Design a protein around this ligand. Sequence first.
Ligand SMILES: Cc1cc2nc3c(=O)[nH]c(=O)nc-3n(C[C@H](O)[C@H](O)[C@H](O)COP(=O)(O)O)c2cc1C
Ligand SMILES: Cc1cc2nc3c(=O)[nH]c(=O)nc-3n(C[C@H](O)[C@H](O)[C@H](O)COP(=O)(O)O)c2cc1C
Ligand SMILES: [Cl-]
Ligand SMILES: [Cl-]
Lengths: 197, 196
Amino acid sequence: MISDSISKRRSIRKYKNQSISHETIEKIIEAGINAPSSKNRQPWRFVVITEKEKESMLKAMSKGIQNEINDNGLLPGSRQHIAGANYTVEIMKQAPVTIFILNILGKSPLEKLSPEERFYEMANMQSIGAAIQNMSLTAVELGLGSLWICDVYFAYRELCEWLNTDSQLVAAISLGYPDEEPSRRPRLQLSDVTEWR
Amino acid sequence: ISDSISKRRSIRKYKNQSISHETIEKIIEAGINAPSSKNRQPWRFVVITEKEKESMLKAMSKGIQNEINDNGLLPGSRQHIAGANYTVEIMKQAPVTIFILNILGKSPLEKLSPEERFYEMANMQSIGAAIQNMSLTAVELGLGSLWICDVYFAYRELCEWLNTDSQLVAAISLGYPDEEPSRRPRLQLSDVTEWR
Ligand SMILES: Cc1cc2nc3c(=O)[nH]c(=O)nc-3n(C[C@H](O)[C@H](O)[C@H](O)COP(=O)(O)O)c2cc1C
Ligand SMILES: Cc1cc2nc3c(=O)[nH]c(=O)nc-3n(C[C@H](O)[C@H](O)[C@H](O)COP(=O)(O)O)c2cc1C
Ligand SMILES: [Cl-]
Ligand SMILES: [Cl-]
């Protein structure tokens, strides 16, 4: 039941220290690949960060966050969220695997966009969310947990340089066997978010 | 869910068969259970049933004509207008179409700072997770669906029709399927994955 995984899925921030096999990662990515996308453009690209390169990753992250703390960053209206970003770095350090998700069709966050450009971003970004959600749900099916991460935006330039990518950085997802079982997070009810016409 | 992820197709032919309200609620409930950045839950849903179908279709056709008349918002995408017209015909066949809004969204006509972009990107991913949950739940229930951004060819017209100041993200049409498409092409793992 996908309904079962949809209901049971949680953001997991404590993991078992146990390695995840390449094959398990393969299965999760191949669920992402099966997402729908605008014009079947499939704009998602993935960079799997293993133990090999984790420390270097985390250093780039931390440099970006420090740059933000120093007021040389990109999110001056979100200083209250820097503490959360530092917590996410810790979670990424402990998680056995983190996968970066890129948008090969993405334009820089630093550039100003026409309405048409915005619509392409919106379409592609939604599509990538479908992929990452597929990955998340597949992790649940496999007995893993995951955490979807946009705190990487506090080190946007630094991580794009680290990745040496010409693509737009969208997110990371950390994965592993879970070491917590959170109850359902708060949600607005269907009456709060739906208008029937 | 692995079954539904695999089996899911974009469906563009529908039976003439209504959907119960509780079925629609189950689909929306799946959406609500998506993750979202800061648990902001930016999605809002407007469910369009047969009573308002014609009015919907008229607003979207208006926008499409405005694009054809070079008075639209996607002048670089004229080659895609024919597809948008086909989407209108598909929305006509579906018993239900749900519009998905981003209550936190800025107009496509406004210019965004890097920080505003990041917030949009995070919200848009979140809404994609919701709409994918809806799509997968439709499959599980024996329904089909079509995720729609061709609505952008009538962005202003549809926001006016919906009487909303929120950002229009997408529509999803829902119904009992009258086709069973073969898998659509996909890139392979090697094409999209780098290992570090
Ligand atoms: C964000 C998004 C927007 C889409 N917009 C439309 C649309 O307006 N009309 C349409 O016929 N299909 C639309 N699609 C469906 C895609 O064409 C379809 O997902 C892609 O061709 C892959 O086919 P599949 O979904 O059957 O695997 C959209 C899909 C997504 C994810
Ligand atoms: C696009 C997106 C970005 C997110 N970014 C982070 C993040 O950087 N760090 C974190 O701890 N959680 C992050 N989350 C997880 C959310 O906080 C979580 O989905 C929300 O609190 C609801 O909890 P649940 O997923 O357990 O239902 C993100 C989720 C999404 C969808
Ligand atoms: Cl499409
Ligand atoms: Cl968050």
